[PDB]
């Protein structure tokens, strides 16, 4: 469960093929690299996303396919960020769906 740690997730992004898609923001928002193409997987909701298009963004795409992710929904999780404030800044604004 060191993957609960952003630091650990960030480390899996070795040989990340997308120079334009921020691996730091992906790791920060629950994702880790699966090393299969460009697909990443959220450690908190389990969604797997790949075939990224340059118009795609880390958080919105994540919310799009997993609107109920505990991390994005801002409910408690075992996530250990590197910088809490940076995480707060990027997570979707509180919105009761």
């Amino acid at each position: 469960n060191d993957l609960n740690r952003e630091e650990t997730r960030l480390k899996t992004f070795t040989d990340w093929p997308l120079d334009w898609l921020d691996k730091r923001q992906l790791a920060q928002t629950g994702m880790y690299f699966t090393h299969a193409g460009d697909k990443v997987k959220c450690f908190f909701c389990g969604v797997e996303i790949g075939s990224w298009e340059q118009e795609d963004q880390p958080v919105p795409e994540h919310q799009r396919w997993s609107p109920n992710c505990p991390l994005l929904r801002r409910r408690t999780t075992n996530n250990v960020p590197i910088n809490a404030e940076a995480l707060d800044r990027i997570l979707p604004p509180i919105s009761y769906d």
Partner: peptide
């Protein structure tokens, strides 16, 4: 993007 796995 494409979701290969959906919760």
């Amino acid at each position: 993007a494409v979701a290969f796995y959906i919760p």
